[model samples]
Target chain A: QCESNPCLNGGSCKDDINSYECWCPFGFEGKNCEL
Target chain B: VVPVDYHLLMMFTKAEHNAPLQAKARVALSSLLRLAKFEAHEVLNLHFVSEEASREVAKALLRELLPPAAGFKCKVIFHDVAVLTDKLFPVVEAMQKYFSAGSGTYYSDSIFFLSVAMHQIMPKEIPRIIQLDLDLKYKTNIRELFEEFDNFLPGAVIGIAREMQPVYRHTFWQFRHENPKTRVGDPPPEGLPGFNSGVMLLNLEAMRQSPLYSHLLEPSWVQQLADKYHFRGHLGDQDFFTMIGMEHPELFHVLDCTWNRQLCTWWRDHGYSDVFQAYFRCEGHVKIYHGNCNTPIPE
Candidate 1:
């Protein structure tokens, strides 16, 4: 279901039925860790 | 022999008629009692700055929240807001414009800035206190947080954690926008993202003794910082601390962000989603979770 898993760096993408949750890494962040 | 007391203060006003505040305070205190551990013989003094009508509600909540097999004795003191605000207004009047709501109309809103002038409001005999928010849940021993006081640097008076959101970045937009390379509102490590006041260790004694902090509290100094930073905020004490802290970082002890792990990302969803995550991330253990903005606390 996470075909478009956008989480970067240490961020983990947890896909839900509707949207998703990007459980971000300690110091990295974003919808993905773009910043 | 009188046991030494570990004092903790929380602003718990307006609970008499506010249902949401009651619910949040209930969970906050219950979770605190549930996770809190302390050494025997030492007393933990919890102070609530409450409105008179909310006394019974707060009392009832404490009765249910006290840990069943407590390691340390507990005492609750209710300080009236009416009395404290009278003491607070004069000391905090100057900075009111930058922090209070409306357009120079509500003088009583000065009470919201009490923590900024607590050193003046409380008795001089009380040296130190940890002021916390009612919407916070404790995940570690409160005593351990208090012990962090020993780590204060020479000039440090207040110990606080960094603001976990990019709210300061948004607030300082004009300043940051003007100075493209400025790190004023950027994320931590390399930048200063400002601070959150949810779990603050106010060294009242140090605050009283610090000529620099006292000078900053002067109306002229507050105005100078406001003018310099283009700072206009509505979050009361935290706003004052954040603005002044921008100029005087040395006066504060920057606690590990985990000590006040703030969990809210409204800014992420609204705008600045790209960089919001950088500011929101708190590494390591979460000693206290602040559910500000009514965000639900996850298990």
Candidate 2:
């Protein structure tokens, strides 16, 4: 379900083979600085 | 409310040269003195620090304009010619004495060595000070300009010129980009007024307590910025001021254009004088006119 889960808060969810990544928007830094 | 003590301090440096321009400079200074006197400020201390060959010209110019007894009301001191060769220690020493005396604020004509001067005087617990550029030619009532900084009694106030108004926003954004620690978030908002270094106000007590003064004159930083950005044009002083603003945003306040209407070519063509008069008539906010490229009118 991780692939189906949307990256919330204006972040773009990218499907990377078997995994996924969240490209955060402005004002956010690092991989999870947003959280 | 007690009025803050402030003094106008200027330096004579040779950037470009011409005899007629020198005469114009004298005339401009006379008008400045007249305006200062009109405002009823306690003291007007002037120092004629020599730059290069222009030192002699500057001295001659001052001698011609200032009366022999002029030093009484507005004390005038000249930089030792010899110091230009080896060091600025003597000039620094003189400034230290003035700052320690803690009468009012110190205003310089340009930013050439003002930061260095501020560093020297930082040890003292002086209350307030500012350094203005010589190229600024004022043509407005002084009272209006003084009112803008009235609220920020214990803070630094900087004036923004009308022509280069947009630069401040750009600078603010740039500052946010380089320093993420600041509260200003990503992309930075636009339309914020840019500050002009032609006129600046400093809370001497705050400056003395801050670390900003320590690195202001760092040769490496100043030189690197100068070289990378070619910081020698109209925005030279402004660039330095912007850096300071970024470092200490909370300590800074923006003075309206009424206090510093930098008369660039565009401003002149756009009826800057009329705008100035309008501001004075309506808001009564302008205190100093930075006659950057405009000719100085006889007061």
Candidate 3:
């Protein structure tokens, strides 16, 4: 969950009901903002 | 050949404290420099509206991100945000009441509404410029966006993409309820979908010369239009432009949504799931990706 801070490269994590959404920064994109 | 300059402006303030903004700025500069192409005769003049600390950060980013040999000479200019906001507050204060959500028009927030009166604030030498958000990724040549200026109609002063969401439809609900036949909030192809300010082409020369455009900046003028439509909005410049565009469509040249393919779907889950895709769908190539509303860009 967001408690672990899954988003990387300064991406923000939005906690959903059971899952989470990573709002990646401008240039990078991926499931966990890995790209 | 006489060298020509292409002016591009971006707001990069308070980045020293905002990690997300710093990251966005870093990525945006990388993507822009990567896909940008200009002839030897054409120079890319990069302008950033930033404060002292952030200006240093942006300078470092530009130094590291700019390609060594990119056909054109790249010039960077940093205008202090405080200075620009000082000049903008008086000009945009009247219109803020209708577009801004804050209880009062703060001088600090005036910079967000600068585009509405850019023709007046910017020097006459910069006849045209593209104002872009830091949350953008370019997939095509940045110079190509400059070409869109030629597509502007006789009265058009700005070129912008439509809002790829039902945000306006929901905003203009009161007006829509009163006028069922109106297209003020409807989806594209036929509806008067509002605009997204993530990417904009401002024709300074046209804006300065157009009597109609100048009149729209008056407090009385904005009040009449807002009153007629019962309009109240919270998104600075775009909101003001949308309200005015509703009354005077001729003042704008609608850019293809592909130009600013916004990747935010917050409204989809927030009561507009049904008609979200209707406004969200962009069919052609995506020249620029706008990761607005904290949304991420696509690979």
Maximum-TM-score candidate: 3
Q: How accurate is candidate 2 locally (lDDT)?
A: 0.44
lDDT of 3 by residue, B202-281 (tens): 99999999999989998899889988977756578998989888999999999999899999987665456678889999
Per-model TM against the reference: 0.87, 0.54, 0.88
Preferred candidate (TM-score higher): 1 or 2: 1
Error of 2 at B7 (Å): 2.8
True contacts kept of 2: 0.00
Candidate 3: regions farther than 4 A off = A1-35, B67-69
TM-score winner between candidates 1 and 3: 3
Question: Which tens-of-lDDT digit does each residue in A1-35 have in candidate 2?
Answer: 01111222221112323334544333444444333
Q: For candidate 2, lDDT tens digit of each residue in B1-299?
A: 33334444455656246755565566557656555432234444555555557667766666666642333245555554345323434333322211221221122323343544453433363355455567655565333454555666344444333334333322234344455565422112332233456666655555556565545445565555434322222243454555444455555666655566555433222223333232222135445556554445323
For all candidates in order, the CA lDDT equals 0.79, 0.44, 0.82
Error of 3 at B280 (Å): 0.5
lDDT of 1 at B161: 93
Name the TM-score of candidate 2. 0.54
Each prediction's DockQ against the real complex? 0.02, 0.01, 0.03
How far does residue B20 in candidate 1 sit from its true spot (Å)? 2.0
